[PDB]
């Protein structure tokens, strides 16, 4: 329609055409709602949004991810076998829609558990990396200490060298 | 509307949904400056599964001329006096989901020579 | 208001990370004006962490620094420039990710 | 690892969808599909058997990061103190080589 | 639905330092000319 | 100065371009009954 590849430079640059001291300063940290791109992308939010918002939760608050992921893997294979069973008996039965909906529900809980794991991994990475950094600094310090002794070894070699010449 | 040769119109959302009849449809849209809201091409947007509207009775129409499956899709604007009678008006070529108007031989040569002189 | 200023400046800086938009501005002659270089110098406030916290597309910041060298804006009017810079950007991105993945997988499969 | 796990979960479904599709659409196909599903299911299981229940991540995470900050500071001091004295060596020991060079050239 | 890997070293480079150490440097090597040394190191290299 | 590519560049808009309207938002069909009687031109370099 009428719009081009967006309106070109305007407003802030017009303001900017000044000298020495006249241009406006930077904007404050709007700690609320903004409009980057098209999404609102407002501040103050979590990393993995609870599955309770938008879908049912089939898992209790114990949530031992390792055990529940293993159960969910089993439920999915068993539910596939039941979907094959609906095909044996009545392809048109109402349950076919439910079984197709129930298997999808299971595939989504596995992704929510994977999302719990990603921060479990962010937290672990924040914890380590500085452990590798720690060891590398100590090793680099040991190398310098050893190099200096070897440089002092060279100093004593030079002392031996004066009698060596005499 | 100043110079139709110097205008380009696109829509990134339409670019993924693109191939053959899709091209005719995109051109058919409305907001494209080349497409007229008058003439006969507007009434094909109103008609459904039409298969021969340009012949028996006539008028300004837009028809695909040559097509390369991925990107290249050339469109031609015809004015029919009667069935089996075609008069070509202009050609609009779409490269990479970007519509341009095909430059004339003489007009393009002359303007570019004026830039060189 | 200052809110609209912040939002428009954030959108503009995030948009500057596009080589197509940079070539657009360079060809249209916006860089030659001495007002735009002062606007760019003012835009350096995004390097602060409190301001960088709101940047969704971080690839812009580094690019912004290049725009201050005064030789990056004299060039880049060419389309081959945008071609090459976007090529290297997408190449770094995709090759880093998929090459790490493929190297790990191939080494794990070959060592076995 | 986690991306591989997600892709494996998605594929576990791929072999279900594909299996049923094939069915609606001979014996070797069902055999290979069954083998495929069972193989990838066991792989998903053994991959899940990897990431652990886990613990700390704060209490121990915070304590460890604080200790690491302290030790980074002390290691920086040790490496520099060595470094001031390391660079000290080359500083006037190359001037001792220049004294020897000056005495040789003055001859 | 799949969620992907975190930036990790990338986010670290973003939040602490600003000089992006990722992608290619060939941008600067091919487009930006080098800055010349002052007398401090001109003559220093002279005496080395 | 850059790889295999047309060895020529111009002023600015060989042709100037434009764009459509905000697509996320738009109207509806509101229909009525009849009453009652291949390649890829992507930036990724080709082998």
């Amino acid at each position: 329609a009428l719009p081009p590849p967006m309106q070109y430079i305007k407003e802030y640059t017009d303001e900017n055409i000044q000298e020495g001291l006249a241009p406006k300063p930077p904007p404050p940290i709007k700690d609320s709602y903004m409009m980057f791109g098209n999404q609102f992308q407002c501040d103050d939010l979590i990393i993995r949004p609870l599955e309770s918002q938008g879908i049912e939760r089939l898992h209790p608050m114990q949530f031992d991810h390792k055990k529940e992921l293993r159960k969910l893997n089993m439920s999915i294979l068993i539910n596939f076998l039941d979907l094959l069973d609906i095909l044996i008996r009545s392809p048109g039965s109402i349950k076919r829609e439910e079984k197709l909906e129930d298997l999808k529900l299971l595939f989504v809980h596995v992704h929510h558990l994977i999302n719990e794991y990603r921060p479990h991994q962010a937290r672990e990475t924040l914890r380590v990396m500085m452990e590798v950094q720690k060891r590398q600094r100590l090793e680099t310090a040991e190398r310098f200490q050893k190099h200096l002794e070897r440089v002092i070894e060279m100093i004593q070699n030079c002392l031996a060298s004066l009698p060596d010449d005499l | 509307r100043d110079n139709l040769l110097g205008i380009s119109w696109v829509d990134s959302s339409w670019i993924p949904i693109l191939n053959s009849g899709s091209v005719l449809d995109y051109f058919s849209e409305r907001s494209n400056p080349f497409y007229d809201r008058t003439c006969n091409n507007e009434v094909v947007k109103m008609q459904r599964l039409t298969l021969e509207h340009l012949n028996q009775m006539v008028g300004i129409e837009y028809i695909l001329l040559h097509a390369q499956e991925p990107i290249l899709f050339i469109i031609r604007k015809q004015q029919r006096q009667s069935p089996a009678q075609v008069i070509p008006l202009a050609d609009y070529y779409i490269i990479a989901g970007v519509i341009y108007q095909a430059p004339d031989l003489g007009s393009v040569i002359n303007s570019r020579v004026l830039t060189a002189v | 208001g200052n809110r609209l200023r912040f939002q428009l400046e954030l959108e503009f800086v995030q948009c500057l990370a596009n080589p197509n938009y940079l070539n657009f501005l360079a060809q249209r002659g916006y860089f030659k004006d001495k007002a735009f270089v002062n606007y760019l110098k003012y835009l350096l406030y995004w390097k602060d962490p409190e301001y960088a916290k709101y940047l969704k597309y971080p690839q812009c910041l580094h690019m912004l620094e290049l725009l201050q060298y005064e030789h990056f804006r004299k060039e880049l009017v060419n389309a081959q420039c945008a071609k090459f810079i976007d090529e290297q950007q997408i190449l770094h991105w995709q090759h880093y990710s998929r090459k790490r993945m493929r190297l790990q997988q191939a080494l794990a499969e070959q060592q076995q | 690892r986690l991306t591989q796990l997600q892709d494996a979960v998605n594929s576990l479904a791929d072999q279900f969808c594909n299996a049923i599709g094939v069915l609606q659409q001979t014996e070797e196909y069902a055999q290979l599909f069954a083998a495929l599903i069972a193989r990838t299911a066991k792989d998903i299981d053994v991959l899940i058997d990897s990431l652990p229940s886990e613990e700390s991540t704060a209490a121990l995470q915070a304590a460890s990061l604080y200790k690491l900050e302290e030790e980074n500071h002390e290691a920086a001091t040790c490496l520099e103190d060595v470094v001031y004295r390391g660079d000290m060596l080359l500083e006037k020991i190359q001037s001792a080589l220049a004294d020897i060079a000056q005495s040789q050239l003055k001859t | 639905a799949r969620l992907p890997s975190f930036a990790i070293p990338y986010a670290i480079d973003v939040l602490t330092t600003g000089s992006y150490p990722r992608l290619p440097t060939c941008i600067r090597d091919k487009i930006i000319p080098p800055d010349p040394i002052t007398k401090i190191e001109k003559q220093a290299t002279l005496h080395q | 100065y850059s790889p295999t590519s047309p060895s020529y560049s111009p002023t600015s808009p060989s042709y100037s371009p434009t764009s459509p309207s905000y697509s996320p938002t738009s109207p509806s069909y509101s229909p009525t009954s009849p009453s009652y009687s291949s390649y890829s031109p992507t930036s990724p370099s080709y082998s």
Binding site: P5, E11, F36, N38 | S12 | - | T3 | - | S40, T42
Partner: peptide
């Protein structure tokens, strides 16, 4: 980087022209 990212893939590292057009700087200035 997307797992399925491919040469035809539209998603790109700059802010993307299409997002600039619908973006506030593109529309609010007009």
């Amino acid at each position: 980087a997307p797992l399925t990212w491919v040469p035809g893939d539209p998603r790109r590292p700059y802010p993307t022209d299409l997002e600039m057009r619908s973006g506030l700087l593109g529309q609010m200035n007009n």
